[PDB]
Amino acid sequence: WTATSGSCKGRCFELQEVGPPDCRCDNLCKSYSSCCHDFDELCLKTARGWECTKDRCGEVRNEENACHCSEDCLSRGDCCTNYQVVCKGESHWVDDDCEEIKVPECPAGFVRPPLIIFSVDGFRASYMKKGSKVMPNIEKLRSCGTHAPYMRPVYPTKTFPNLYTLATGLYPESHGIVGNSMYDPVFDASFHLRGREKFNHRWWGGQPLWITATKQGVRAGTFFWSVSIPHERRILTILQWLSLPDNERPSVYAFYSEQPDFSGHKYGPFGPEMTNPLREIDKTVGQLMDGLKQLRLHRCVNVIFVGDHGMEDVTCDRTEFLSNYLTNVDDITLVPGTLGRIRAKSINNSKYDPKTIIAALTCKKPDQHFKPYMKQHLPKRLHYANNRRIEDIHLLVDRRWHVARKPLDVYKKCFFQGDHGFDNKVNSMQTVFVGYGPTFKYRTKVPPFENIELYNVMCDLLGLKPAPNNGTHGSLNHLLRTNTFRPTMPDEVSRPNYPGIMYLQSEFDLGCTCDDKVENKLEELNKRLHTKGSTKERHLLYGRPAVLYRTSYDILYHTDFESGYSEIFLMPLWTSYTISKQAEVSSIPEHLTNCVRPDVRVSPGFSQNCLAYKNDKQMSYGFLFPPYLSSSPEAKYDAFLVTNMVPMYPAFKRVWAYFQRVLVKKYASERNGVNVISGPIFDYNYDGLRDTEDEIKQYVEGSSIPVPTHYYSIITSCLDFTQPADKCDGPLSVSSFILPHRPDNDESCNSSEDESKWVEELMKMHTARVRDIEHLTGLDFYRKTSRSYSEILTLKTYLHTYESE
Ligand SMILES: *[C@@H]1O[C@H](CO)[C@@H](O[C@@H]2O[C@H](CO)[C@@H](O[C@@H]3O[C@H](CO[C@H]4O[C@H](CO)[C@@H](O)[C@H](O[C@H]5O[C@H](CO)[C@@H](O)[C@H](O)[C@@H]5O[C@H]5O[C@H](CO)[C@@H](O)[C@H](O)[C@@H]5O)[C@@H]4O)[C@@H](O)[C@H](O[C@H]4O[C@H](CO)[C@@H](O)[C@H](O)[C@@H]4O[C@H]4O[C@H](CO)[C@@H](O)[C@H](O)[C@@H]4O)[C@@H]3O)[C@H](O)[C@H]2NC(C)=O)[C@H](O)[C@H]1NC(C)=O
Ligand SMILES: O=C(c1cc(OCC2CCOCC2)nc(C2CC2)c1)N1CC2=C(C1)CN(C(=O)N1CCn3c(n[nH]c3=O)C1)C2
Ligand SMILES: [Ca+2]
Ligand SMILES: [Cl-]
Ligand SMILES: [K+]
Ligand code: NA
Ligand SMILES: [Zn+2]
């Protein structure tokens, strides 16, 4: 119930929301069917439109007008945005030369530069170049301020998940908005685009910026706008708020545009109908900037121009139907379109089996345009699993396609030519970022970055302490002139042991054998030196990783590699080695094919054993430092140490052996040497965080040897590839992966072929940031470089995406 008989007189666009049954006058009252009777008349005036004309200048105030051109309008804060241009001979902001804003130039009474966040739905990154002729205001913000060539959204590349990530700095799995449509089985409730359930606060987790601000005594404009409030009125409301007295005036504001997304769905991302919507958004930006200039705020406010996601060409004919794969199609519920999410239609159906659904959807048609996954097997870079609202079964849909349950769903609902939602590394889904103002840098291009990073920067711009989030605070310091956040490296929690030779060969009863019984003072001191770390500077280039949790581990040195060996997990946490451009690849000699050697530095009780692998008929083993890249025949024996062995399914060893025997050398050739850090990851509860021992669901049969869920590599080299990886004076270049440790290669439809036709494609799909590996391992990398810590944080957030330009 709403008592709509109250009045909006003196309350239009009031900041504090009043509670039912009282009638509302705030910018969302329309959306709740709750505005007072006179809200349109008083608060949505349209008379005479949005622009001053010559003949209105100096008019007698008529309060019915949408905006004013009377002499008192600046003092009232309600001039049309072009007033000073039309009536006082001023220039539009866009027509003024770019001049560096070295310090905030603010009116008296402003405690800090306000922040205005201008968000555009479906604004694809390439619009900045392709639409540049029709967007002069936005182009000036971009060229004069700080910009990235594109900003990476979160998956799924839908509106509400991305807007709420922008608001919180959280992955969707953490903030809870995991799609535009959702079912929560605990609540037994559904979230939809249409209707009232989506306003219930229980959907919305984390702490969005407007709450962070309010908690810390920074006032916020209302961030949301009912669809029928026209853009010109939204801008005028912002500008009116900015004339409030100091103690009532917000410091942070948000404007949201439904365009260009609305037209892009109808016309495709580059339909000829798209020029007008881009022009219209640019005009709105011009209104805001002119309005700020009238208020003498144009060199005071920080403006962010940001998109949620891009837009791809997608038509009704490019739809795959689950009815062409499944016999049982009426027993499932599908969330459809540019991603798929599948669950049982009835919880009372005991004949529901995810395993048979997955199998029926795997590599069934030669050109199949989606791939099924159990959510825990999705690429870890998506961070799309740890929420009860994400269904166990997921379909990753190819760009340009949809998935639907049955054909009747597509025509009892062609209309559309554009859509979005796909994998957040897809070029068409990339969006935009521009920052302009005193706190942003001047005429500065920054590398592409992820939208999860922006909440921290928005907090930095407002003097707020961010709530705990998934950004890496400091990684975006290079965007800012001032207000940078200067973090310290985390403290190492566990110090390593440095064991020497402590065990005789016969103390080991591991069931391992090696043909290594082959016997010199010249070369005897040299092998002693290698075991004490004489080559460590070559193979450990950026210092040892720090262990950020409590555990027992040993540093082990070798001629060709160094490792941190966990006495708890019985295997290395990390293995570090350097491969020069000139390194040679060699075979595993015939006589050493099954060689595994006890390590006389590590007790039998803290070692793996070969008998377990013999008895486990599903599990085999691999090595972290590759025997193929040994520096010499003698050094090769180190690679067969029991301390370098890790459990590997045979199906995964195909992947791993190709990476080690072929790809590492390829990268060293291309990059002028590489440094590799490889290791295991355990994430059985798919939370993106290192498992404790008591979370491990699988061991090598009969043993305490834990089975990794994934294997990582971090591959570092010199950004200036004229310098070798091991003598690099400047910035670094990195690519990383987190490969799923799976007992089959069902993910790779072409896996019956030679590894050269499918393995690198798998690895590209599972590309990762160093920071992703940090979360999954409790390790901190790059602790000892010549580089600034903020630059290192930026490096750790880098993702190598493998898309063209
Ligand atoms: C990305 O960044 C985020 C933010 O930093 C990271 O997420 C954090 O990670 C922590 C570890 O997973 C986690 O800490 C736990 O919090 C528990 C209390 O949580 C409530 O309070 C906070 C603070 O206000 C609130 O934000 C939480 O919000 C979640 O839940 C509500 C719904 O209830 C959602 O609306 C919201 O979206 C959010 O959901 C997300 O997180 C939860 C987990 O909290 C997931 O389950 C959801 O799927 C979703 O992803 C909560 O309202 C706290 O009680 C925990 O303590 C347990 O573990 C400790 C170990 O230190 C142990 O000492 C205790 O014994 C305790 O265990 C007991 O409970 C167990 C479970 O019932 C039980 O099994 C045991 O036997 C014990 O009885 C714990 O400290 C933190 O909550 C989240 N925060 C957020 C916002 O998500 C995220 O990790 C980052 N991701 C990456 C990849 O880096
Ligand atoms: O006002 C907001 C808004 C604005 C908003 O800013 C958060 C800011 C935080 C800081 O960084 C800048 C962003 N945050 C929210 C939610 C997340 C808290 C909401 N609205 C969004 C939408 C509205 C109005 C209507 N609409 C819609 O019907 N479609 C649903 C269907 N859909 C759409 N486009 N394409 C498509 O499929 C959009 C989407
Ligand atoms: Ca985990
Ligand atoms: Cl969705
Ligand atoms: K075996
Ligand atoms: Na296969
Ligand atoms: Zn859309």
Best CA proximity match to 633, nearest among 559, 582, 555: 559
DSSP state of 104: -
Nearest CA to ligand 1 atom 29: 205
Contact partners, residue 555, CB within 8 Å, separation at least 6? 496, 497, 498, 544, 562, 563, 564, 565
Contact partners, residue 268, CB within 8 Å, separation at least 6? 274, 311, 313, 417, 418
Nearest CA to ligand 1 atom 3: 469
How far is it, in rounded angstroms, from Cα 599 to Cα 637?
A: 11
Residue 176 Cβ < 6 Å to ligand 1: yes
DSSP state of 684: T
Q: Closest-lying ligand to the alpha carbon of 336? A: 4
Nearest CA to ligand 2 atom 1: 224
Residue 691 Cβ < 6 Å to ligand 1: no
Atom of ligand 1 nearest to the CA of 688: 93
Atom of ligand 1 nearest to the CA of 174: 50
Measured in angstroms, how far is the CA atom of residue 648 from the centroid of ligand 5?
Answer: 9
Measured in angstroms, how far is the CA atom of residue 455 from the centroid of ligand 1?
Answer: 20
Q: Closest-lying ligand to the alpha carbon of 702? A: 5
Measured in angstroms, how far is the CA atom of residue 758 from the centroid of ligand 6?
Answer: 9
How far is it, in rounded angstroms, from Cα 161 to Cα 312?
A: 18
Plot region of 672 (φ>0 → left; ψ -120 to 50 → alpha; else → beta) = left
Best CA proximity match to 274, nearest among 157, 130, 142, 419: 130
Measured in angstroms, how far is the CA atom of residue 381 from the centroid of ligand 3?
Answer: 15
Nearest CA to ligand 2 atom 7: 163
**Using a 6 Å CB cutoff, which residues line ligand 2?**
117, 119, 121, 159-160, 163-164, 166-167, 180, 193, 209, 223-225, 227, 254, 256, 261, 306
Residues paired with residue 147 on neighbouring β-strands, in sequence order: 434, 445
Measured in angstroms, how far is the CA atom of residue 662 from the centroid of ligand 6?
Answer: 20
Angle at 399 between CA 305 and CA 736, to 5 degrees: 75
| Best residue among 26, 117, 121 to mutate for probing ligand 2, ranked by most atoms within 8 Å of CB | 121
Instruction: Give the count of beta carbons closer than 10 Å to the beta carbon of residue 615.
Output: 14
Plot region of 757 (φ>0 → left; ψ -120 to 50 → alpha; else → beta) = alpha
CB 94 within 8 Å of CB 140: yes
How far is it, in rounded angstroms, from Cα 628 to Cα 623?
A: 10
Which tokens belong to 607?
Answer: 């070692």
The runs of H, that is alpha helices, within 600-686 are 610-615, 633-639, 650-658, 664-671
Atom of ligand 1 nearest to the CA of 689: 93
How far is it, in rounded angstroms, from Cα 702 to Cα 722?
A: 51
Cα-flanking dihedrals φ and ψ of residue 340, to 5°? Answer: -120, 140
Given the structure tokens 């912002």, which residue do they identify?
A: 238
Nearest CA to ligand 2 atom 9: 167
Atom of ligand 1 nearest to the CA of 387: 48
Nearest CA to ligand 2 atom 14: 163
Residue 470 Cβ < 6 Å to ligand 1: yes
Q: Which residues are annotated as a binding site for 1-hexadecanoyl-sn-glycero-3-phosphate?
A: 159, 180, 261, 420
Q: Which amino acid is at 262?
A: F
How far is it, in rounded angstroms, from Cα 425 to Cα 298?
A: 35
Q: Which residues are annotated as a binding site for 1-tetradecanoyl-sn-glycerol 3-phosphate?
A: 159, 180, 261, 420
CB 47 within 8 Å of CB 65: yes
Q: Which residues of 315-352 are buried (b: 16+ CB within 10 A; e: fewer)?
A: beeebbbbeebbeeeeebebbbbbbbbbbbeeeeeeeb
How far is it, in rounded angstroms, from Cα 683 to Cα 692?
A: 9
> Regarding beta strands 710-718 and 620-623, do their DSSP bridges make them parallel or antiparallel, or are they unpaired?
unpaired
Residue 418, exposed/middle/buried by CB under 10 A (0-12, 13-18, 19+)? Answer: buried
Measured in angstroms, how far is the CA atom of residue 790 from the centroid of ligand 2?
Answer: 32
Residues with CB under 5 A from ligand 3 (ion): 683, 685, 687, 689, 691
How far is it, in rounded angstroms, from Cα 455 to Cα 457?
A: 5
Q: Which amino acid is at 134?
A: V
Q: Which amino acid is at 419?
A: D
Which tokens belong to 703?
Answer: 């043993």
Per-residue CA distances from 714 to 734, 735, 767, 771 (Å) = 7, 6, 10, 11
How far is it, in rounded angstroms, from Cα 387 to Cα 390?
A: 6
Residue 170 Cβ < 6 Å to ligand 1: yes
Which tokens belong to 61?
Answer: 């105030």
Residue 165 Cβ < 6 Å to ligand 1: no
Per DSSP, the three-state class of 242 is coil
| DSSP per-residue codes, 433-469 | EEEESSSBPSSEE---EEGGGHHHHHHHHHTPPPPS-
Measured in angstroms, how far is the CA atom of residue 160 from the centroid of ligand 2?
Answer: 6
Residue 157 Cβ < 6 Å to ligand 1: no
Measured in angstroms, how far is the CA atom of residue 606 from the centroid of ligand 5?
Answer: 20
The runs of H, that is alpha helices, within 90-135 are 127-130
Given the structure tokens 């037209």, which residue do they identify?
A: 263
Nearest CA to ligand 1 atom 90: 470
How far is it, in rounded angstroms, from Cα 284 to Cα 77?
A: 18
Measured in angstroms, how far is the CA atom of residue 651 from the centroid of ligand 6?
Answer: 10
Nearest CA to ligand 2 atom 38: 159
How far is it, in rounded angstroms, from Cα 583 to Cα 635?
A: 14
Atom of ligand 1 nearest to the CA of 175: 37
Given the structure tokens 């069934």, which residue do they identify?
A: 364
How far is it, in rounded angstroms, from Cα 539 to Cα 554?
A: 17
Q: Closest-lying ligand to the alpha carbon of 650? A: 5
Residue 687 Cβ < 6 Å to ligand 1: yes
Q: Closest-lying ligand to the alpha carbon of 156? A: 4
Atom of ligand 1 nearest to the CA of 202: 35
Measured in angstroms, how far is the CA atom of residue 156 from the centroid of ligand 7?
Answer: 12
Nearest CA to ligand 2 atom 28: 193
Measured in angstroms, how far is the CA atom of residue 618 from the centroid of ligand 5?
Answer: 6
Residue 58, exposed/middle/buried by CB under 10 A (0-12, 13-18, 19+)? Answer: exposed
Residues with CB under 5 A from ligand 6 (ion): 745, 748, 751
Residue 685 Cβ < 6 Å to ligand 1: no
How far is it, in rounded angstroms, from Cα 252 to Cα 217?
A: 12
Q: Closest-lying ligand to the alpha carbon of 753? A: 6
Peptide bond into 156 cis (omega under 30): yes
Per-residue CA distances from 553 to 198, 371, 556, 718 (Å) = 49, 40, 10, 30
How far is it, in rounded angstroms, from Cα 569 to Cα 751?
A: 31
CB 183 within 8 Å of CB 343: yes
How far is it, in rounded angstroms, from Cα 704 to Cα 706?
A: 6
How far is it, in rounded angstroms, from Cα 228 to Cα 366?
A: 47
Per-residue CA distances from 565 to 344, 612, 642, 675 (Å) = 44, 19, 11, 19
Resolution in A: 1.7
Q: Which method resolved this structure?
A: X-ray
Angle at 571 between CA 568 and CA 573, to 5 degrees: 85
Atom of ligand 1 nearest to the CA of 383: 93
Which residues carry out catalysis?
A: 159
How far is it, in rounded angstroms, from Cα 288 to Cα 300?
A: 13
Which tokens belong to 63?
Answer: 């309060």
Residue 206 Cβ < 6 Å to ligand 1: yes
Best CA proximity match to 286, nearest among 114, 93, 97, 140: 93
How far is it, in rounded angstroms, from Cα 369 to Cα 312?
A: 15
Angle at 545 between CA 543 and CA 551, to 5 degrees: 140
Per DSSP, the three-state class of 239 is helix
| Best residue among 174, 386, 694 to mutate for probing ligand 1, ranked by most atoms within 8 Å of CB | 174
Residue 791 Cβ < 6 Å to ligand 1: no
Q: Which residues of 181-203 are buried (b: 16+ CB within 10 A; e: fewer)?
A: bbbbeeeeeebeeeeeebeeeeb
Residues paired with residue 565 on neighbouring β-strands, in sequence order: 554, 572
Contact partners, residue 437, CB within 8 Å, separation at least 6? 101, 113, 145, 300, 301, 302, 303
Q: Closest-lying ligand to the alpha carbon of 703? A: 5
